[PDB]
Design a protein around this nucleic acid. Structure first.
Ligand SMILES: Cc1cn([C@H]2C[C@H](O)[C@@H](COP(=O)(O)OP(=O)(O)CP(=O)(O)O)O2)c(=O)[nH]c1=O
Ligand SMILES: [Cl-]
Ligand SMILES: [Cl-]
Ligand SMILES: [Mg+2]
Ligand code: NA
Ligand code: NA
Ligand code: NA
Length: 326
DNA sequence: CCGACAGCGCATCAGC
DNA sequence: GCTGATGCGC
DNA sequence: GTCGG
């Protein structure tokens, strides 16, 4: 938080470009700038000083100078008074409502939390649960609660079958004091890149976690990716815990290290690392690292026995999860 | 000093 | 229904 | 919006 005011401004600028301008490249440029400033040590005192960091060009620089001068950005002070974009920004905070849907609702005259309530029929399933738990999903999760959710999820998957391996990734694996949701990587020997012997492996896990009333709702469900809602159990007379977003991602066991690298993130770190693989002539996704040819087509998967192997290939020093919070 | 910008699962739609 | 495009979230 | 070429 040495340049919290600046990175906040940049993050709000990015939010606007994504939600209102629907210019996803402006969005990503601001958030690259926000993150490189966020880890930059000591107080930024000038747009030109900032300019030295990669991803900050002239326009961010003149914005930083204005912010440092006045404490404000006029550009944002008008965005915050513009009633239409302010309504669009707000609706995208419901999970499952993004730019298109947010602007669709606002055109129809549906502009506040109440308006969504008076209309749960114009909302797809994901959007209704996002609305149901709107206040809950804006709350972070203390690591202590994350640790309890970890023990539940793990002891339940082992109840289904003792060869499941579940790994809590996301901000938790990076060591964060709090997380926005809970991310679970799931491997089972039966499911590799060679074939799935029998699917439903993710369903059985979801089913069990539901039967014990940990998973309370579903946002999306498929054979390898579950997105839903879960809740810790409270004790007698105690206030209930908030409900929590939970994503579970089943990955071929032979592709674990690529999957755990993917799912540990952050999303910005994943994007730098993948852009850098491409410059090195490699492509990385959550399953494999593969060489880039001369034509550009991905070659065949390179062999991987650790996260560090992935790093070695693109000639990065190994970064521990803790230092991946970009 | 203009093209590329990371990559993919699931849900929903439109045109068959 | 299937295919491919888009929306959304990760 | 930014930058490597
Ligand atoms: C949103 C997003 C995510 N991920 C990968 C990396 C994430 O670390 C991981 C988990 O997604 P998410 O839970 O949204 O991010 P997080 O790092 O755990 C931050 P929070 O604690 O708020 O969940 O998915 C991406 O690779 N690209 C993305 O755009
Ligand atoms: Cl642009
Ligand atoms: Cl489809
Ligand atoms: Mg998370
Ligand atoms: Na720069
Ligand atoms: Na949303
Ligand atoms: Na997540």
């Amino acid at each position: 938080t040495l340049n919290g005011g600046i990175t906040d401004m940049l993050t709000e600028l990015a939010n606007f470009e994504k939600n209102v301008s629907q210019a996803i490249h402006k969005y990503n440029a601001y958030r690259k700038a926000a993150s490189v400033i966020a880890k930059y040590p000591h107080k930024i005192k000038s747009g030109a000083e900032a300019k030295k960091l990669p991803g900050v060009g002239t326009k961010i620089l003149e914005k930083i100078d204005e912010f440092l001068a006045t404490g404000k950005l006029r550009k944002l002070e008008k965005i915050r008074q513009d009633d239409t974009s302010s309504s669009i920004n707000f609706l995208t905070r419901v999970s499952g409502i993004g730019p298109s849907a947010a602007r669709k609702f606002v055109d129809e005259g549906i502009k506040t939390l109440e308006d969504l309530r008076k209309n749960e029929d114009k909302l797809n399933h994901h959007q209704r649960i996002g609305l149901k738990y709107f206040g809950d999903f804006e709350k972070r999760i203390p690591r202590e609660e994350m640790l309890q959710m970890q023990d539940i999820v793990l002891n339940e998957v082992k109840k289904v079958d003792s060869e499941y391996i579940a790994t809590v990734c996301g901000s938790f694996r990076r060591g964060a004091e709090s997380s926005g949701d809970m991310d679970v990587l799931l491997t089972h020997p039966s499911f590799t890149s060679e074939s799935t012997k029998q699917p439903k492996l993710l369903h059985q896990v979801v089913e069990q976690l539901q039967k014990v009333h940990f998973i309370t709702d579903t946002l999306s469900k498929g054979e390898t990716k579950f997105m839903g809602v879960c809740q810790l159990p409270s004790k007698n007379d105690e206030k209930e815990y908030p409900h929590r977003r939970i994503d579970i991602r089943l990955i071929p066991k032979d592709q674990y290290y690529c999957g755990v690298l993917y799912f540990t993130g952050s999303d910005i770190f994943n994007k730098n690392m993948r852009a850098h693989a491409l410059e090195k002539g490699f492509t990385i996704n959550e399953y494999t690292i593969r060489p880039l040819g001369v034509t550009g087509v991905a070659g065949e998967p390179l062999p991987v026995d650790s996260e560090k192997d992935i790093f070695d290939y693109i000639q990065w020093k190994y970064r521990e999860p803790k230092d991946r919070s970009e």
